[PDB]
Design an enzyme around this catalytic site. Structure first.
Site, mmCIF file in Angstrom:
data_model
loop_
_atom_site.group_PDB
_atom_site.id
_atom_site.type_symbol
_atom_site.label_atom_id
_atom_site.label_comp_id
_atom_site.label_asym_id
_atom_site.label_seq_id
_atom_site.Cartn_x
_atom_site.Cartn_y
_atom_site.Cartn_z
ATOM 1 N N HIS A 11 0.820 -1.211 0.000
ATOM 2 C CA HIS A 11 0.000 0.000 0.000
ATOM 3 C C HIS A 11 0.854 1.262 0.000
ATOM 4 C CE1 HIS A 11 -2.144 -3.350 1.963
ATOM 5 N NE2 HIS A 11 -3.166 -2.935 1.239
HETATM 6 C C1 LIG Z 1 0.761 -7.288 -4.190
HETATM 7 C C2 LIG Z 1 -0.405 -6.345 -4.069
HETATM 8 C C3 LIG Z 1 -1.366 -6.574 -3.091
HETATM 9 C C4 LIG Z 1 -2.455 -5.723 -2.949
HETATM 10 N N1 LIG Z 1 -3.384 -5.992 -1.968
HETATM 11 C C5 LIG Z 1 -4.392 -5.192 -1.850
HETATM 12 C C6 LIG Z 1 -5.367 -5.478 -0.823
HETATM 13 O O1 LIG Z 1 -5.331 -6.419 -0.033
HETATM 14 N N2 LIG Z 1 -6.396 -4.581 -0.775
HETATM 15 C C7 LIG Z 1 -6.557 -3.484 -1.594
HETATM 16 O O2 LIG Z 1 -7.542 -2.763 -1.425
HETATM 17 N N3 LIG Z 1 -5.634 -3.220 -2.562
HETATM 18 C C8 LIG Z 1 -4.616 -4.034 -2.673
HETATM 19 N N4 LIG Z 1 -3.682 -3.770 -3.633
HETATM 20 C C9 LIG Z 1 -3.886 -2.617 -4.513
HETATM 21 C C10 LIG Z 1 -3.196 -1.353 -4.029
HETATM 22 O O3 LIG Z 1 -3.291 -1.263 -2.610
HETATM 23 C C11 LIG Z 1 -3.872 -0.144 -4.674
HETATM 24 O O4 LIG Z 1 -4.924 -0.622 -5.499
HETATM 25 C C12 LIG Z 1 -2.962 0.713 -5.548
HETATM 26 O O5 LIG Z 1 -2.446 1.795 -4.777
HETATM 27 C C13 LIG Z 1 -3.674 1.256 -6.767
HETATM 28 O O6 LIG Z 1 -3.476 2.683 -6.828
HETATM 29 P P1 LIG Z 1 -3.052 3.392 -8.165
HETATM 30 O O7 LIG Z 1 -4.032 3.285 -9.226
HETATM 31 O O8 LIG Z 1 -2.687 4.849 -7.878
HETATM 32 O O9 LIG Z 1 -1.735 2.627 -8.568
HETATM 33 P P2 LIG Z 1 -1.556 1.733 -9.864
HETATM 34 O O10 LIG Z 1 -2.710 0.826 -10.013
HETATM 35 O O11 LIG Z 1 -0.213 1.034 -9.759
HETATM 36 O O12 LIG Z 1 -1.500 2.751 -11.033
HETATM 37 C C14 LIG Z 1 -0.299 2.924 -11.812
HETATM 38 C C15 LIG Z 1 -0.602 2.702 -13.271
HETATM 39 O O13 LIG Z 1 0.234 3.563 -14.080
HETATM 40 C C16 LIG Z 1 1.017 2.778 -14.957
HETATM 41 N N5 LIG Z 1 2.319 3.414 -15.125
HETATM 42 C C17 LIG Z 1 3.325 3.504 -14.201
HETATM 43 N N6 LIG Z 1 4.393 4.131 -14.633
HETATM 44 C C18 LIG Z 1 4.066 4.477 -15.933
HETATM 45 C C19 LIG Z 1 4.772 5.163 -16.940
HETATM 46 N N7 LIG Z 1 6.007 5.645 -16.785
HETATM 47 N N8 LIG Z 1 4.159 5.338 -18.128
HETATM 48 C C20 LIG Z 1 2.924 4.861 -18.289
HETATM 49 N N9 LIG Z 1 2.161 4.200 -17.418
HETATM 50 C C21 LIG Z 1 2.794 4.039 -16.252
HETATM 51 C C22 LIG Z 1 1.071 1.389 -14.334
HETATM 52 O O14 LIG Z 1 1.298 0.405 -15.335
HETATM 53 C C23 LIG Z 1 -0.341 1.285 -13.769
HETATM 54 O O15 LIG Z 1 -1.269 0.946 -14.791
HETATM 55 C C24 LIG Z 1 -2.574 -4.618 -3.804
HETATM 56 C C25 LIG Z 1 -1.622 -4.386 -4.786
HETATM 57 C C26 LIG Z 1 -0.534 -5.239 -4.924
HETATM 58 C C27 LIG Z 1 0.489 -4.959 -5.989
#
Ligand SMILES: Cc1cc2nc3c(=O)[nH]c(=O)nc-3n(C[C@H](O)[C@H](O)[C@H](O)COP(=O)(O)OP(=O)(O)OC[C@H]3O[C@@H](n4cnc5c(N)ncnc54)[C@H](O)[C@@H]3O)c2cc1C
Ligand SMILES: Cc1cc2nc3c(=O)[nH]c(=O)nc-3n(C[C@H](O)[C@H](O)[C@H](O)COP(=O)(O)OP(=O)(O)OC[C@H]3O[C@@H](n4cnc5c(N)ncnc54)[C@H](O)[C@@H]3O)c2cc1C
Lengths: 650, 176, 650
Positions: free
Chosen positions: A578
């Site tokens: 997270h």
């Molecule tokens: C191992 C694991 C366990 C998890 N367990 C839980 C859980 O128990 N409960 C829960 O609620 N959530 C869980 N999650 C999810 C996590 O807690 C959140 O969902 C996450 O913070 C999603 O937020 P975000 O969209 O900002 O990040 P992300 O989903 O990572 O958004 C980033 C996106 O931007 C893209 N990107 C990155 N860099 C670039 C670049 N340079 N150019 C273009 N695209 C790029 C990536 O490919 C991705 O699509 C887990 C995640 C993981 C990996």
């Protein structure tokens, strides 16, 4: 210079994660602007290991490459953090998903929404709970999670025990125990245990439950008409075949939307203080430049938002000049600072009995519980010195409790402890930190192209070295330094003091069984319990034995026991995934999510959160993206969209 | 070693099925051996205790200078007498197996330091290292995304695996 | 009338099955003509149940719809044949795949190429073995099958026994036993059994082996670099992402090729004796018409080629006029006549022994053997009156033998026999007919649109009713009528007389076990053996007991035993899915594959075969399509393409 890939528009959204798709979808739905999404990833709509929820546990893994999706460089970015000086200098790799849907394509699918108190006491003005709770409702309606579809008697026993001891915690007048909720009163907030007992909703609309013991979570899976479950995630819902063409165009209603699948972005071409263009590398290896007319949006996750900002030109001018950044725009020495994350030490329980198989039945994982069987969310322990001022009048969420069958410590610890996963009279309990103290930061290392591993510093379980200063006014830095280790030890005691009510409940629930904590060792917990109840609120003086001046053999016992106990949370634990708070509100952005020092860029992913929410951080990022929809568009449209309007599924 | 097969694979030389799978548009030569056969050394560590009232006289002049860099010997050895995995020429030619090294202080990892009960503060302890030069395990390297040179591609290297017996008669399962 | 779907060209190929893709691929490779393929089906490149070979056995089946791909109307056409008057009037449904790759997308993946003798003695001029064997080499090189990747001692025991008794069959001078090959001589053609024994290739280039006992087949699976096997079939190879765009265009080299995924064809618009256009229904329900300039090709499978011909106008004018066909072109009363297929009665074996698990190990199915563990291909039995003239001088392939663990009879038979699949001391043996006698025909029923079930007649195990005619000159119609039942009974005896050599081999191979045939019953086989060896070549007089005039109680015993034994092959058996010979050479088409009575249409799928080959009928259809490539193009190009030139895989 003939590049026909002219993709000039007015809005560009970068990174289709838990917040990118929500924004792109609801942004092209409610307006006519020309929207572009860039993700650098294909759509795993057909992969069995993705769409099947049980594939998370490695059901479709080839026998020669038994690794799942977080450890797979084809599915997830692999950043490693510099040696943790608090954990014997052990570097760790935590992933961010690389696909449409971001980390939601590879996660465990849980829906904690976070307590009400956190958004009221830790967020800026305009982000208090009553300003956003509607957005949380919107996202949970857009997903429609489900509950567990299988009863079990262990949940009943544990809930029984917790209500038994919460009875006493309600009396005795102390105000800050971990099973007291102030929005309910004298009655405990413990779910009833019998047939036809109602269900306490953890993610309730009005946030009454900030401490409550329940029986099931809300996972993001749906059941198909056939009988098979699938995964319902951000890309699945907001960006599916019904809404976007295979060529990346939207369909009809959303004809003003463009999505490019494999396009890694490098930085933001930036004229004056006005962002004007963006470049990216396709799957040949070509650089394509696209114009921006109106605004640029960054949804690239916690680890890679500050990084793309720093390559763009915003950060510490001295540092970026040092490593060779040619173009410098705004001198903000706070970009990439204040990184936060959860942390979950692990313990396991032994059951002694000839026919204990009858006790542990119906604990296996199905796509509806995903091995989660409770149990509740608790508050501060009685004896934790690091509590905010409001603790007397408001209840805060501290620990998230989880129970699971089997053993979950790491393999080396499994061998060391003498207990393995083959045998079946053992199960795991987890006391997660939601208010985890340590803070770190992110620094790029080379101004060439987006690198998988930038400098990430995160030191958790550090130690305090006493000075020659008089003891009187050096204590309140020992407190600040030793906060997290104290929190972990108190979580251990909290779990420990449950098993005896569990003993009684099992004895008079029709079970002649025995419950006992074998990891960490039995004696090393009984000694901690005795030390706590014999030393009171000054139990944590004994982390440093040179300042207590207590040379009594009892004091030496206490010091040695705490020394040994300090070892388990360092190794026998699991850093969560997270990541948050890289460009928080105030530090790097204002309350309208715009980047200080520039007029037409915003960051709207989980990095922009000024505090980690009360649980798993998925709903929060989607909420931030949803609110950003309103702030960009100007007037509240997603605000009172009727809850019966939901995206159709394909 | 790590980034030559990778740039080759992005270039177009490798396993056509795999590179097509992960999305390489231009394919040139179909060599399914590119990025295969990775080798490396490996050095288990041991340390020695010295008991004596004035052993400081024994361990003097062991600190590291820019000329020895904490290395004080000691020699290179051949096969042990009782190692079944020796080539045919072992009867007539001597092979290099172990590289021996002696060093002051302790060099095990910090967690092992805590576990063993012996730390680096005290000064009656030193380390000996028996490096493998003929280390057996072999691995391979596979890229993961055909966009740009990535810091971490798929690298597989399993060293101290275990053997699971089958129902086969003992006689002809020994030489695996 | 604005239909912009103007897909006028010069060649149109209808049905991309085992022969459609080969033709389309190698036809657009070696020329510049504008090619169009129509299939009415999407591409299952991503479906786990297709691409994974083990998915054939129902590994990805939802628990509420446990049916595999042959019984699934979304994957396969479902035609049912009219009541089989020889099988208690039991209608049967046999499928043809509905996808790119045809039945190869849903089949068991075996590569019998067929004997050499069949193409020399049963095919027209120009189709003798030495004219085509190169094309068989071409297809087997284009696939590159593999062998079994697991040893087992049961194969060794059975091969041991067969060589033991083939020793005696080599002596005694009789010329037409089932283990005599004339291209080898005195030495048996039985694979050696010890470590470092060479492998006898069944599909050898020069066709020396028409009778041989081996240990493994050649299945059409490949191993990926990861460690997982996939399916290598017609659509997989000749029509994959590397060769055709997702929009149906070919790429570069094959830019002159068009493929339409979902397009059901109805009939052939037909000006004069010259085919000019074709219509089809897309997935709205629209009728699209496309022009043909140069030739039309029909690759729609055995069941649905004569049907589309009959709707087009070629067939029996009286009949097609009767059911309401308005346009009539050529009066060929042979269209849709002469249908042929294989048939495999089943038997199973009991093993009595305390630790027989050691005997039956390593028999489970992997993606390399697909539950096949041998055993060999045999010739005519000594006592079968229906043998061709060449039997004295050439060896013919009659039975294909197969051994498999577990039980494979139908469920009702399982219950009836008292033996189930749970227990593990039982296995199955199968004596397939390759020269199966009965013949049927296909007639459409409604001249509106392609229907899933047209009139299909196929009566197998019919009986003979004696007349008042003197016995002397009514025997040689009883022979013709009773051929297949005699063949099945002789297959039973052939399998039976193996188990005793297997007894001896097991006794002195380190095994104290016992082998016995329990289905059909033990006694009912010993009695058949005694009757055979006591009545000689006139054993089959006793099928009809009113003509033998043998009222001796021994004769009544024999008649009753044959009566009871006639029941098992009717019910306890499995009609295969090798449909062929609907528009064979001479009957409906000439040796250059053109349709009689018209100048510019051909049929080139398995329906055009004038005889069923020596085994599983997959290579044969591909061979026919490959040869058609040459006949259309005019000069031999695919003929001596070097074998190192193979399609690349994606
Ligand atoms: C191992 C694991 C366990 C998890 N367990 C839980 C859980 O128990 N409960 C829960 O609620 N959530 C869980 N999650 C999810 C996590 O807690 C959140 O969902 C996450 O913070 C999603 O937020 P975000 O969209 O900002 O990040 P992300 O989903 O990572 O958004 C980033 C996106 O931007 C893209 N990107 C990155 N860099 C670039 C670049 N340079 N150019 C273009 N695209 C790029 C990536 O490919 C991705 O699509 C887990 C995640 C993981 C990996
Ligand atoms: C259950 C089963 C088991 C099998 N087992 C084996 C085995 O053990 N060994 C072996 O070698 N082979 C096996 N096969 C394969 C089979 O023996 C041959 O591969 C088959 O004859 C392929 O020949 P074909 O291409 O002419 O027929 P098909 O592959 O059926 O070709 C017909 C094609 O035309 C299409 N089509 C039909 N009607 C229309 C229409 N009106 N409009 C448009 N398109 C149309 C169909 O969708 C299909 O793509 C099996 C097949 C099945 C179904």
């Amino acid at each position: 210079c003939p590049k026909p890939e002219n993709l000039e528009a007015d809005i560009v959204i970068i990174g289709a994660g838990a917040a990118g798709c929500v924004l792109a979808y609801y942004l092209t739905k409610f307006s006519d602007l020309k929207i572009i999404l860039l993700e650098a990833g294909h759509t795993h709509f057909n992969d069995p290991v993705v769409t099947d929820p049980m594939g998370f546990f490695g059901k479709y893994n080839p026998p020669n490459e038994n690794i799942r999706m977080s450890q797979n460089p084809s599915y997830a970015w692999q950043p490693a953090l510099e040696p943790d000086t608090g954990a014997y200098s052990m570097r760790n790799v935590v992933a961010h998903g690389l696909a449409v849907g971001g980390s939601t394509a590879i996660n465990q699918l849980n829906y904690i929404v976070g307590g009400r108190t956190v958004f009221d006491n830790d967020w800026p003005t305009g982000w208090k709970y009553d300003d956003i709770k509607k957005y949380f409702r919107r996202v949970l309606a857009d997903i429609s999670p489900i509950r567990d579809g299988t009863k079990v008697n262990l949940t009943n026993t544990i809930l029984e025990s917790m209500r038994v001891l919460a009875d006493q915690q309600v009396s005795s007048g102390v105000p800050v125990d971990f099973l007291i909720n102030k929005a309910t009163g004298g009655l405990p907030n413990i779910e009833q245990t019998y047939q036809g007992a109602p269900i306490v909703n953890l993610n309730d609309y009005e946030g009454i439950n900030s401490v409550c013991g329940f029986k099931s979570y809300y996972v993001g899976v749906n059941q198909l008409s056939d009988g098979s479950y699938i995964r319902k995630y951000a890309g699945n819902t907001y960006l599916n075949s019904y809404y976007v063409d295979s060529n990346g165009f939207g369909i009809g209603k959303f004809s003003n939307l463009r999505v490019i699948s494999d396009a890694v972005v490098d930085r933001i071409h930036f004229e004056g203080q006005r962002a004007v263009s963006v470049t990216y590398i396709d799957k040949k290896g070509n650089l394509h430049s696209v114009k921006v007319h109106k605004e640029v949006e960054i949804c690239s996750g916690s680890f890679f938002t500050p990084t793309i900002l720093q390559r763009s030109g915003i950060g510490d001018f001295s540092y970026l000049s040092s490593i060779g950044v040619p173009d410098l725009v705004y001198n903000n020495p706070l970009v990439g600072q204040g990184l936060r994350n959860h942390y979950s030490p692990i313990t396991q329980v032994s059951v002694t009995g000839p026919d204990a198989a009858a006790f542990l039945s119906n604990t296996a994982a199905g796509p509806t519980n995903m091995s989660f069987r409770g149990a509740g969310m608790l508050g501060y322990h009685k004896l934790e010195p690091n509590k905010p001022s409001n603790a007397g009048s408001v209840t805060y969420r501290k620990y998230e409790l989880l129970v699971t069958g089997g053993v979950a410590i790491s393999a080396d610890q499994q061998y060391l402890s003498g207990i393995s996963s083959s045998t079946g009279n053992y199960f795991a309990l987890i006391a997660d930190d939601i208010r985890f103290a340590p803070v770190g930061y992110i620094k790029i290392g080379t101004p060439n192209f987006p690198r998988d591993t930038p400098k990430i510093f995160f030191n958790t379980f550090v130690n305090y070295t006493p000075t020659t200063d008089p003891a009187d006014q050096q204590w309140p830095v020992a407190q600040k330094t030793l906060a997290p280790l104290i929190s972990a030890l108190l979580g251990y005691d909290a779990i420990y003091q449950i098993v005896q009510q569990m003993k009684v409940v099992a004895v008079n629930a029709g079970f002649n069984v025995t419950l006992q904590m074998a990891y960490p060792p039995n004696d090393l917990l009984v000694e901690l319990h005795n030390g706590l109840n014999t030393y009171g609120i000054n139990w944590w003086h004994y982390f440093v034995p040179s300042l207590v001046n207590d040379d009594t053999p009892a004091g030496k016992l206490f010091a040695s026991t705490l020394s040994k106990l300090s070892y388990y949370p360092r190794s026998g634990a699991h850093l969560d995934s997270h990541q948050s708070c890289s460009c928080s509100i105030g530090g790097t952005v204002d309350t309208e999510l715009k980047v200080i020092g520039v007029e037409n860029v915003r960051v709207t992913d989980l990095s922009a959160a000024p505090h980690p929410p009360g649980g798993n951080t998925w709903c929060t990022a989607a909420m931030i993206g949803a609110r950003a929809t309103d702030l960009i568009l100007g007037k509240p449209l997603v605000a009172n969209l009727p809850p019966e309007d939901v995206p159709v599924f394909t």
